[PDB]
From a paper:
The N-terminal domains of p85α include an SH3 domain, capable of binding to proline-rich sequences, and a BH (breakpoint cluster region homology) domain. The BH domain can bind to and regulate several GTPases including Rab5, Rac1 and Cdc42. In addition, the p85α BH domain, either alone or together with the SH3 domain, can bind to and positively regulate PTEN activity. The p85α BH domain also exhibits Rab5 GAP activity to stimulate Rab5-mediated GTP hydrolysis required to inactivate Rab5-mediated protein trafficking functions.
To determine if the patient-derived p85α BH domain mutations impacted the overall folded structure of the BH domain, several of these BH domain mutants were crystalized and their structures were determined using X-ray crystallography. X-ray diffraction data collection and structure refinement statistics for bovine p85α (105–319) mutants (E137K, E217K, R262T, E297K) are provided in Supplementary Table S1. In contrast, several of the p85α mutants (E137K, K288Q, E297K) showed near wild type binding to PTEN, and either had enhanced (K288Q) or reduced (E297K, E137K) ability to stimulate PTEN lipid phosphatase activity. Three BH domain mutants, I177N, E217K and E297K, all showed significantly increased Rab5-GAP activity, whereas the E137K mutant had reduced activity. The location of cancer patient-derived p85α BH mutations with significant impacts on Rab5 binding (I177, E217) and/or regulation (E137, I177, E217, E297) are shown in the modeled p85α BH domain: Rab5 complex. These mutation sites are located in regions of the p85α BH domain, well away from the Rab5 binding pocket. Further, crystal structure determinations for several of these mutant BH domains indicated that no major structural alterations were present. No significant differences in protein flexibility were observed for any of the mutant proteins, suggesting that the mutations did not alter the rigidity of the domain.
Numbering used by the authors:
A (entry chain A): 113 to 167, 172 to 298
B (entry chain B): 113 to 167, 172 to 275, 281 to 297
The structure:
Amino acid sequence: STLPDLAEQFAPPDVAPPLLIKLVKAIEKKGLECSTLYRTQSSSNPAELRQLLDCLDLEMFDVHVLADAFKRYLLDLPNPVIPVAVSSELISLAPEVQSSEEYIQLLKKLIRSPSIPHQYWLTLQYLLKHFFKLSQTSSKNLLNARVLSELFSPLLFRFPAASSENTEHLIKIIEILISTEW
Amino acid sequence: STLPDLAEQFAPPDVAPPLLIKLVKAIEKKGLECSTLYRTQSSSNPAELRQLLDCLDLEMFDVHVLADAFKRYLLDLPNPVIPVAVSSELISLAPEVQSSEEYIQLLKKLIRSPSIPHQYWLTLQYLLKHFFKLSQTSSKNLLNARVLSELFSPLLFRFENTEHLIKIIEILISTE
C-alpha cells in the first residue's frame, strides 16, 4: 500500500502518472487485440504485482501480468481515481434526476472541484482514452464500452454498494464516457 | 484568480512550485538588504500583480512589486500553504496546550498527513528556508523571525486565538 497519491505522482503539464503511462503503452503494444485482456487472472499474486510497480522496460513482462498490475495499480492508489467525495454524491441522487447527461454533468463538476486536485480528473480522462482505444478493436478483443465499464467501474469508484438504479447509473456514465472520447 | 492548487503546480521530485522559486530567487537577489522588504505597499493593484503571476525575467521588475506579488501568490492559492484542517486543529487546542515544541511537532504531523498532498509541506519548507535566509541579514532588512512570522503567518494559515500559531512560525524560521 506504498503507492503515492495520484496528486503526488505527477502534476500538469503532464497528463497522467508516468507509471500509468508505461503500463498503458505496454498493454496497448502487446495486448490490444487480446480477446481475454483484463478478463483472465495471471499467476502473479498482489505482492509480486506490487513488486513490479517499483523497479526495467514493462514490455518485457507477460501481457497478462501487465494487465493484472494495471488493476493492482488502481486498487493500491490511496484514494481511488474517482474520489469517495464524488461517488458519495452521485449515489445520493434521486430517481427524478435520472438523465445520464445530468449524472455526467455532476461527475465533471464534482471531480473538477478545486477541493480535488486536477490529477484525479486528468487520470480518469487518460484511462477513458485507453478504454476507448480498446473498444475500437472490439471485433478482435471482444471489449465494448459497457463491459469495460462493468470491469473497471469497481476499480475506479472503489465503492461497496448494493446494485441500485444509482449504481447502474454510475456504470452507465462510465460506459458513456468511454464511448464518447472522440 | 486562476492560480492552481499547490498540488497542481508541481509534484515530487521537484521541491517547490516553479513560480514560487522564480519569485524567491528574484526577491533574494534584489532585496536581501532592503530595510522595507515585504512591509511596503507598492503601487500595483491585485489585478496587475495577478497579471505578473499569470506570466519574463522577474529581475526586470521593481523589488517592491515582486514582494507584493509574493504576497498575492500566497493569498490567491485556492488552499492556503497550511491547510485549514491543520490550522483549525492547532487553534482548537489553544487553551489546553501551550508547549510550543508540542505545537511544532503537531503542525508537522498534521501537515504530513497522507490525506494532504506532500506539496503543502514541501512548499512550507521552501518558504521557511527563504524566511530564514532573510533573517540572516536582519541587521540590514530588519526582518527577524518574529517580524517575518507576524507578516506571513496570516498568509500561511489564512486567518488572540492565533498567537500560538505566530510563535510556531517564529520558531520554525529560527531553527532552519
